[model samples]
Target chain A: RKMAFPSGKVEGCMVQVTCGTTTLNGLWLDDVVYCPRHVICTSEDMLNPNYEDLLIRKSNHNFLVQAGNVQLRVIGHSMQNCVLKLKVDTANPKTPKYKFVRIQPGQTFSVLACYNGSPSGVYQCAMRPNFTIKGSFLNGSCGSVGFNIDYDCVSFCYMHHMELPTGVHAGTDLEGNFYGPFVDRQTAQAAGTDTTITVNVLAWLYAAVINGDRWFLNRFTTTLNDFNLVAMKYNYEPLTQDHVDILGPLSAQTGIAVLDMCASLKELLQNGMNGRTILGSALLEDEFTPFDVVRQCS
Target chain B: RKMAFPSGKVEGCMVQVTCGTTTLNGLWLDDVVYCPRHVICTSEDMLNPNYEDLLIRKSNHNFLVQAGNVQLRVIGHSMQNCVLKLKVDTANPKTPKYKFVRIQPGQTFSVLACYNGSPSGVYQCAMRPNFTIKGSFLNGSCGSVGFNIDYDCVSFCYMHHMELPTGVHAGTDLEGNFYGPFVDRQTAQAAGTDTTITVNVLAWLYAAVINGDRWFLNRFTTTLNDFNLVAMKYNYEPLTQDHVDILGPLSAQTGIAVLDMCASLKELLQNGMNGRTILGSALLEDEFTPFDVVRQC
Candidate 1:
């Protein structure tokens, strides 16, 4: 008995971070969604660059209305901060919905969304930890930088070749006309011969609950937000040869409708009597999961 | 489309032929039993033997039916008389059926047989030249022998190598001591300087269209016709597994009367519906195929 992940994925983005000299293996990322396990992509173990693209451009890829916990384990070694960015509805460019969450390194970060301020009404919940990539370099060549999710500091790591500012700014401590010759310094101070860089980035996702609701998460940066929205236009090409050859056309000859005359109160009291269960029938309607808070793994 | 070859196989008995050399990509025997091809054994093109126990049995390997024209070409350089000796209904050990269709060196050879007839039914009608082994020989060496089934011979080859045979005997002549050093000789003979032997046999039944009414052509040999009748037996085995795993004597579920109808009819009609086409489903009730024949294929 495991939960069903939903079929369509809309939001959720992946970020890349480099850590050290050796290859990394097992790390994880957990998230919450609003559909059954069958509808969500709760990957147990994932490989980078390959499994990363699967979460992009789909209906049910982001957070769901019904919140539940998801866990992802990284399998590679020497990695730093690579988190997921999420988005909801992008059809109405201006009037869009989005959410961004980041897990701090080595710490299990728990998040919960509520409904009507009650446990029963809480729509979503999930947790995950940020994996680290600890490596070293000689001669003050590497500098440390902190990561943020929509202005919230999550993790930190040192990077080579820092892009420091110039022009003697009127701010902090002291200053000079800090300019280059900072360039060829890479080769001059190059930590060559016997130097190593380990990259550990193993991430996975797991979810506990699925409720009939729709919720949207957004991308972290405004630039990525606007670019992707306009880039993907409606696919209006005719259902010509290639389309028909692969899966046939959306049935042109068949149409079905259902009508129930029972009163709403009575219908609510006797729900099971109104529907038939085919051996492989789907329990929920497609593309219509609504958002809700209070849900848990059963 | 290729017309199916009839008179393809020699209606006869079994005899053995042995190998003197290895031929990888050719045929060893020609047509038998209207199969329009020969049962393929060791192929000539292969650099070495791949199938286990293939061509191992020497004696049980004989042609009772010719699929096409009964012929054997000496594809290998080291072969002597790629020979064949025929016998009939050799399965029945008691009153066993037998005959000898001995193959000689030159000329074409045809195998024939008849039920209880004045009409003679000819099995294979083809030509074959003889030379079991050829090329440079120390003790021996060989090449290839082809069995052409007219159209495509590959399928016919697949079906043959799949049959069961004990041993085959071959020499330069019928009297040239042929049995096997089976293992010893075949091994010493199959060295890979490259050799090939091909055989095409076609197996199927043909009718005896005598004066008017169809009848058996060849009479049973005089010695066995002691009771004044040339006999053809209804040798068949039925579906044993489908009968049921049901009874423990006391648990017998006796119901339908399962009779040996085909055997009864073969005895009655003399020849099992040889010419006429069956109306609904042929052989569903009429079993013309012999037990040994079905098993051999």
Candidate 2:
């Protein structure tokens, strides 16, 4: 009789099993134990693949492992006492020289090992579980040209190091990745309190410095600060949570719609100061209502 | 028997009678004629002082003749003729050189010869009956000192000329005689008219000129004219007889009064011009009366 494994065979590598004790291609495997040498896995084996007889024994699993340019995974086996093991061969040139991680039970870990050219490569990670580092993070784009900012509580964080000199960063990582600053500010606002929007603005200020987006920094801050000041000066109450969710888009049609709402508030302030109308038209007509920001944003 | 005459004994005087015969001293009486010298006829012998008696009829008489010095009476014997004659001794110095008069019936006449230097003398006289030469004579003084001034209706007037060479008079006969002008004016008002009084005043004016009685004439006529003017000016009526009778004293009184009145009137006019009262105290008070002139005068 014969049983099939979920993945392809390792070639010129040791394999053993207690059940079949089969021998193939210079390795032995059975339903129980056997020792092996020259262990080299195939590409298919790097997936969460399966095998026979040494067969995972109910396949209970724990940590996840990822590779950068080499595109590899690490799988931990419960039957083997959940030992972390690499599943692929080292034939790819982009593979890091060393990597490390701490995975807890029922926790999943992901990483991108440095594959970019460097003198030395080593990956290091910290496992925090749901000990979430609760804050904002880079998420995505807002519009065709703007960025999205999101709030998040990340389970893990990683650091990749190279022997080659990575120069000091004087600013944010916004331009280093698409929509980086947008995502960072959004994450801050989501995770923080009412004053979080200010933090969000501060994050962009740094991003704009690094990215050399002076125009965006100027307009964005001018619009933000002006809205705040006008709202205060006119006895207008501060915007409530319903007014903005920084996790949304920055466009007039979507997302937080903070920019559009602020512009309108600025116009009202200007009109009143000019004596054209003693009070804002909205206020005079008794048409102003709470949560207007939400409606405008919508 | 011889009878004594009541007037005269004619010595060397002839007397004769005819018609009845009669007898007297140194005279024969018969029906026809007789004559004698130095005849003295008594009253019985001079009956008609004697006549041819035709056996002694009585002679009738018409004139009463008497003698003072020659001592004689003349009688006409014709009862149809009463002629009187006188004969005086040419040697008598008591005779008037000439004298004439007409004695009408029952008229008596007397003449003053102014000749006797003695206490008593036998004087003689004659009468020419039916003889007359008529004229006015100076009758008497106008007052005690004035000459009478009169005009008779018999004819024109005559003036007695005293050839004593009296010159211009220095005052009116009225003043000289005193009260004459006043009486004249009074009489003029009494018996004549206002015009007569004015004439009297004019006469006095002439007298005053002649007499040089400036004070009299001035007062007189000034009183006259002023009274007139005042009377006219004040509407006092013209003087009547009674008014003039009172006026004499009023002239003396009221003239000054009229002057006072006129002066007051002048003052009234002046005041009235100046818008003051026209009559002052006495007149304006109804205190003045018409006869007040007499009182004032």
Candidate 3:
């Protein structure tokens, strides 16, 4: 009778199991001790293979260890521990050495937010100054690029009567990443935090007989402020525990940063802070979710 | 007999200035043939006197010149030419090489003031993060170090009712110079920009019978907030021509920077700004020169 042992999934390494109480290189019975740990990369991966392509540095932070050149310093028949970095010096191919380089510790990017029912999806930052949201607002890309959007925590809502430009207000994020401008239009809204006066704001905007003024807005009309605060949640949330088990620590920190971003954006909307027209196809959850910036709501 | 030209102060050099129609060194009427022009520091002055006292740098800016070791590569007629930095490579004190290093283009610092007076003087930073005002609030030091404070342009004014702590209010400026803290107290004031109520405001604080009310400041107080926009200009200015003809370009840039600072600080005062009860022996230009802090402003 023959039994097969399952292959272990070690970090980017291959497995090599041993057979106990049997001839060397001969299989008799199953052995579990040194199954997968004894492994190495078939070909070397070097960030800079042309030795000293960069200049000798003066900073105290001059130590460098190639990401691919790590190994367990000591391995026992049944145990192994600690990482060892092997450096190469080619001046005398016979002898090698390791040295230093610099790297930034923490980096970030910013993402734009949308109102309830806006076409939401995963986003990325263009590797430039503004760090604006990258790609279409339809399909997401977090699975491919492997990172979180900086502004994921925002509890997006339509704000009332605010005048903002129609492009990607491209600027640096708090993390200094540059982004490009992507202009967007807004839906007309007339509402407040606590009051219910039902009316189709866009219908009113269309009814004004003149050149784009929801007539009542001009005469200090009583029923104009009835916009709803349309809330939009992340399309990427509802993260499962299985994700945490697979992604390691990235899952938790991405969780923390987004929570803070959501609270801060909500505060700004509440702070001393409109819309004029409906050019875009999308609508805020309510016809009255406030928005601004078409010359007359124009 | 030997005669001497008031030796040209061409930068920090022991100058050997040139004189026309003269023999090289075999001189007569103070033969200026390369008098101060062909000069060299007798010894040496290096910010880093120790060799590579740092490591070999791999930056595009890996070049450097010893502030001391510089000279004219060639001379003529009784004439001479450009700057040629000579490097000394100890590997062969025999031969040396010159190369790149980094340096900051501009830098600055802040100065504090008092009413119609304060212990106004030049200050230095403590070489750390916040870049706050430095020194004993007296005795200026620019004549010695040869650089200007970053905030020279500010025309300071007293502000009211802003909740700022007494210590240094320490922070970094537009340029990244770090500084330390220096705390201060306030004096009572009760007036506005256009109106003035003549009263020794501190006297009212004494009369309040309460913990330190300066009185009229509570329950629909009609007279508080009367404060002057007490202006404090640079003690280093009125910089004379003699100061310029002698100091070089450092004179002009310092002049321009301070002017801009004066305009900015004044604008902040105009932009919704105040002050409170006096403490720690200083006054804004008047009893009503806006001040604040100590809870009951």
Best by lDDT: 2
| Per-residue alpha-carbon lDDT of candidate 3 for residues B1-297, written as tens digits (9 for 90 to 100) | 000001111112111111222111111111111111112211131121222222122121222212224322221222111111222221112111211111111112112211111111122222122222222221111111112211112211111111123222222221212122321112222211121111222221222222232312322211111222223121111222332243223224233222232233233234412323222111211121011111111
* Candidate 1 lDDT, B1-297, residue by residue in tens: 001111112112121223333211122222211110112243452334322233334333333232124333222222122322223222312221212233322112221122111112111112222222211111111111111122211112110111002121122212222222222122333211211110110011211110122222232322222211212222222222222121111112122111222222323335544534222112312111221112112
Q: Rate the local accuracy (lDDT) of all candidates.
A: 0.19, 0.22, 0.19
Model 2: per-residue Cα lDDT over A118-220, one tens digit each:
1110111111111121111111101001011112112211221101111110111111121111121111222111112321232222222333332222132
DockQ of 3: 0.01
What are the candidates' individual DockQ scores?
0.00, 0.00, 0.01
Ranking by TM-score: 3, 1, 2
lDDT of 3 by residue, A22-129 (tens): 100100011111111111111131211221222122121222211133312222222122111122221212111211111111111112221121111112222212
lDDT of 1: 0.19
Q: Write the per-residue lDDT of candidate 2 for residues B109-138, one digit (tens) a residue.
A: 111111111111111111111111111112
Off by over 4 Å in 3: A1-257, A270-298, B1-229, B233-265, B272-297
The lDDT, on a scale of 0 to 1, for candidate 2 is 0.22
For residues A1-298, what per-residue lDDT tens digits would candidate 1 score against the true structure?
A: 1011110011121112112221111101232111111111222222113323433433332322211222222222211123222222222222113333332222111111111111100001111111222111112212111121112222211112222221110100001111122321112221111111100000000010122111111122223233223222211111223322211111111110000101111222234324432112212111111110111111
Worst 10 residues of 1 chain A by lDDT: A197-206
Identify the candidate with maximal TM-score. 3
